[PDB]
Amino acid sequence: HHHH
């Protein structure tokens, strides 16, 4: 999962 990517930040933000």
Next chain:
Amino acid sequence: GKTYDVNICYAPEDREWVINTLVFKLERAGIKTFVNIRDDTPGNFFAENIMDAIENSNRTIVVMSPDFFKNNICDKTLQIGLSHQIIPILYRPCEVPYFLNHMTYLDWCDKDVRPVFWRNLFRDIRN
């Protein structure tokens, strides 16, 4: 989907802990790491080496300390890193700039929660 899991952005003054502790542990854990003193291309411009490290890594670890925030390469790397994903580590207490003052970091300086530091770092990288 990048070649390296993480790039490490740090000031030379913090090299001892960065290379012997942080990079050492990351690599032992199977995490593919870009580290300037090994992976930079000699004869490329500084900006080229910054960009190679950032664009070929999933995220950039930022090793915050007083010396980090006085270092030109660190600042340039951080500015581009904000357009991607960073993992800030508070390695030594320092004045954290306004644009990082509302970003969650891994606090190495908080000794009592040091027992979960590596777990948290590796979990984020692997997520």
